[PDB]
């Protein structure tokens, strides 16, 4: 994480950079970036996934410099996020087909990482607001996770009780929570889910792509309590061991966020 | 329609069949290989269109200008530990995949639909509303089969499509992707808006002070460890911006 | 010689055009006969009911000219078309007739090679013949390339036809002719393969403009508007393993205006 | 050639069109548009493809109305290619699943054409300039083909010695040659290769689509010696016979090119 | 460097950059060594000829300052690049070496995981290291992350490198660094999977603009322009079942202009 004053003064620009690590489960000291092997075929009535098998959303709050010397002014300044550049880091590591992965056929190379994937990021001036939805409301989630409380069969579709802030790193399982489109007034989020056994990962990198964060009125996320929030989930697919066991593989996400100062009325 | 703000929102639940009290959002397991002459699907096996009528506040009518919409809970498909058949010995569960249909509509009247059947001889179950007096021509275009989407969880998705020859006061959008191995591909973002205005700059007009939302979001098939398959669907969020229009 | 647009001057016409997939018996409207396979090129005699054909309709329009021997005339000009394939959700019936994907599983979706095509013009669609096998012996009731040779498997300019009869020109024999069709706009996509997924969109918010670079749409000769289509959605696989083409109807809504022309 | 203003007026525009047949190998008198059946698994040291097994680029020269080439004359113009309409002809012929092709399974229809494909066209005022690259530099190419001369292992990557003009129809194998991005100043070319066993052909037709041939300065190919050059390769995929043998299938390409007169000095 | 106006009063440079796939013997230029599989993470020692590496070249340019004493100096600025992968049709040879798709059939096409990447800059490309397996023992002649840890499988900021040697930095170890490369533009797409079809386009009508948001392209501060690439097209499957990477060369044509800058 670096917070850099690119330009100072009234028209100040600050660039915040950071690399957000993935939270795939990390089943031993050597397997950072992977999950525990996947179980299968648990009855819905006895579905108790292990903690280290569940990828969780990544998040961080980045403190920004205070802008207001006198808190009793009629107007106060706030950091406004204007643009974000982002990409997934280490995509070429998946070209290692010699380590650990099941041969595609006799005398062949290892099997590429492939299968269901989810790539998501958000940038806001408040914590990302999430809505809970479950495959199976009867899943018994493990200690260390934060999941929908008092779920019912309606939790498999839409149960408006399941509202959360993404307010803890490595705790909200990706399978339990989605960004909430009915809230998030002060966050922009973007995600794509691609499901299936043989889905190919397709990932682009370039330092020439920028996403504008301004809304229809030309206003970007406003950093409340001088806090910038970054969130991500980048499940790249499944790694298949020679035994046949499968593990999720994730990668870190880079953010470069440009901010300016906006004058707001003192509430 | 003469010269020219409020926001309404809704989470609309999917109607996949719901075969028991625990399997909300799924269908009954699929049967297969029924002869066309003896094809009698059970009600809980048949996903239906979802719809809701939203009342609005009382010369002037409410005009729908934009909609933001997305499918809710897409990441729930990353649960590969519960119920699904292993992809191979020692592997994880099989993802939901296969034929899917994602559709929504926003209008000032109920959605107008046209009936088309795979098999006109299908015997549809009590509780469903399906094309009446079907013939072989119902497998192609039979103009008899007109309906309003006027009841939730009643019009099977397999029997009905939005009618492009009507719906003057509704905008609708749908994509069907068929095949046993089709990957679900679903996007979420709060930065995307669909404009509902036509080429005259007029959106759906809510006569009777009612807004209609409609959807179908069949995500694919869930394959149980036994090999049986069930449709899985997800709720759809709508946020609709409306303005007052003189008429 | 096209003059100015006139401004009563607008009309809309609409039509649903049924597919012509072969219709092997009275129950199987919208399907073909089961597909044969592995016929030697020297003994390839497909049955009529196995061959999907192009659909077409001629729509008469109000007769605008009292006297065709005047210096100037009025003609109907097609300006836009809205079009949609009808009944796409019917493929969500996986309980009827189709082969199980595996033991205890649901039926196999319709999938595989498909072709989606439409045209709107003021003359019949003009077609060019090309054959997989020039030696195919086509059945009575079809209209296919006459006097075909090996060159008919590539480009043989002899094979020019008008789409002037419904349910007669096999899709496998004929394509729209890009060297003609001055007065028709056409659009088609072929996707081939064993397992290709159908992907079909519906919306009442999409309009195709038919005006050329000079701002002129198709002009309706003899006050007739022509619509044409082919919508082979894929193959249906029966429990036995046999396969049949499945097609669907196409809707057209066409806006026309009056255009002054010189005689 | 210094480029001046576009000229308009009487006879300052023309349109030419052509259908260019594919050159897939044509293994006998009945199998025009196909190749000979594919061999497989030849060691790189003993790889001797038969001529009839090798698809080649197609090309033709279209004469244009004669303009005076005398650089000192008082009305010096060249034809300039502005747009091209083009599509592959006969795509629906692949819906014949009754003739020749292996059944997909017992009682099923024939197997569709599918697999690796290449769709390419070029329009220019000179012959298309090509660069040679080989899968295997040791391939022994057959009489009647023009292939990279005296190749080395570097010819499997980039060997700048392998420069050729597409100056003969049905002679330059598609597998040996690509358009050269370091030349072709006076040609516009466009190609897509999609490889794989089960790749679906995807082909669009419409008479409403046009490709603009003007560069960033608004200048299209200028036709030297009043000749317009068209080139193509349209390998649609592999046809699988009942035996399991495979043959390339190709189709003709249509071109309609609009040209205008350009003043030059 | 303080950037002033464009000097008005433009050149082009070009390069074909060869791929560095491993080249296991004198006849298999453009391929890797056969791929091993199923090595335990604890005993993963890939041979050098099995590892594709990034390609790079430096293009020398003449200094523009006849007087090096002027208040304002001049530098070459890269404005646009035309680029293309060369020899894509060579994959239509299904008669040589590749495993038959089925009895009596043709050879198996090249397919599977692929990576297509290029960069143009006024400084060598700046890279960040990320590993599949931090315990991999890389072979002599490669340059790979130093003193890796488990964090090197996600993001370890210690692993910074310059692409300063051709055929040395394995593609599997390194990515362009989005936190640096102020003076380089880079573009890459990774597509992974066993049966992924190569999809490659060629046209001489496509240009990539290299100007940033302020209208300034990479500046050749030391009178040098750097081109970099990786074009792994997929896997070639031999008749025996063994697999090898196949790569192809990349062409670059770069338009340069003269840019006034303040003298340091
Ligand atoms: C559209 C079309 O015309 N398809 C036909 C193709 C096509 O003309 C060619 O592929 C174009 O190059 O030809 C087919 O030919 C087959 C042979 O492949 C027929 O000759 C077919 O052959 C049958 O006998 C074959 C088997 O014994 C086979 C087993 O491996 O060996 C073949 O001979 C080999 C030989 O052993 C080998 O040394 C040599 O290198 O290659 C030859 C093949 O070229 C035998 O020919 C068979 O398939 O069982 C006997 C059949 O009676 C005969 N059928 C006909 C109609 O002649 C083709 O499939 O490629 C036929 C296809 O219809
Ligand atoms: C996600 C989940 O919980 N999946 C279940 C799955 C699911 O509930 C159904 O598919 C929804 O339709 O059911 C699985 O078990 C089924 C139960 O239906 C099989 O055991 C199936 O049961 C048959 O008999 C049933 C009775 O068991 C049940 O109590 O009552 C109904 C009538 O209301 C039936 O009589 C049946 O459905 O016909 C007998 C049949 O042999 C069984 N089929 C197979 C292939 O074994 C399932 O589909 O596997 C269990 C899964 O965990
Ligand atoms: C990439 C990798 O580590 N693959 C190994 C996997 C993997 O560790 C787990 O599936 C993650 O949950 O484990 C495999 O099984 C072995 C037993 O053969 C595991 O118990 C692991 O054994 C170790 O000795 C090892 O390094 O392989 C120690 C390791 O800590 C164990 N893993 C855990 C989570 O405790 C498997 O096939 O699943 C072996 C595979 O190579
Ligand atoms: C949707 C539907 O109606 N499917 C039925 C099909 C279908 O009517 C035809 O394929 C259309 O041409 O027919 C199925 O039965 C056929 C009837 O033709 C078979 O029983 C075949 O009958 C024969 O009499 C024949 O030659 O047609 C003998 C032949 O051996 C039979 N073929 C097989 C593979 O058994 C069909 O499976 O095609 C029944 C299907 O429900
Ligand atoms: Cl909750
Ligand atoms: Cl009805
Ligand atoms: Cl004819
Ligand atoms: Cl040469
Ligand atoms: Cl390092």
Residue numbers in the entry:
A (entry chain D): 32 to 298
B (entry chain C): 34 to 37, 44 to 97, 107 to 295
C (entry chain B): 33 to 39, 42 to 297
D (entry chain A): 32 to 296
E (entry chain E): 32 to 40, 44 to 298
Paper excerpt:
The human polyomavirus BK Virus (BKPyV) is a non-enveloped, double-stranded DNA (dsDNA) virus that belongs to the family Polyomaviridae. A polyomavirus capsid consists of 72 pentamers of the major capsid protein VP1. Gangliosides were found to mediate cell attachment of BKPyV, and gangliosides GD1b and GT1b were later shown to function as specific receptors for BKPyV. Crystal structures of Polyoma, SV40, MCPyV and JCPyV VP1 show that receptors are bound in shallow grooves formed by VP1 loop structures on the outer surface of the virus.
We incubated BKPyV VP1 crystals in 20 mM GD3 oligosaccharide solution and solved the structure of the resulting complex at 1.7 Å resolution. The structures of unliganded and liganded BKPyV VP1 are virtually identical (r.m.s.d. of 0.4 Å for all atoms of one monomer), indicating that GD3 binding does not induce a conformational change in the protein. GD3 engages BKPyV VP1 at the top of the pentamer, which corresponds to the outer surface of the virion. Contacts involve residues in the BC1-, HI- and DE-loops of one monomer, as well as the BC2-loop of the clockwise neighboring VP1 monomer (BC2cw) and the DE-loop of the counterclockwise neighbor (DEccw). In both cases, only the terminal NeuNAc-α2,8-NeuNAc motif interacts with BKPyV VP1, while the Gal-Glc moiety projects into solution. The terminal NeuNAc 4R is the main contact of GD3 with BKPyV VP1. The sialic acid carboxylate group is recognized by two hydrogen bonds to the side chains of S274 and T276. The second sialic acid of GD3, NeuNAc 3R, has weaker electron density and makes fewer contacts with the protein. Its carboxylate group forms a salt bridge with the K68 side chain. BKPyV VP1 specificity for the α2,8-disialyl motif can be attributed to residues K68 and H138, which form contacts with the internal NeuNAc 3R.
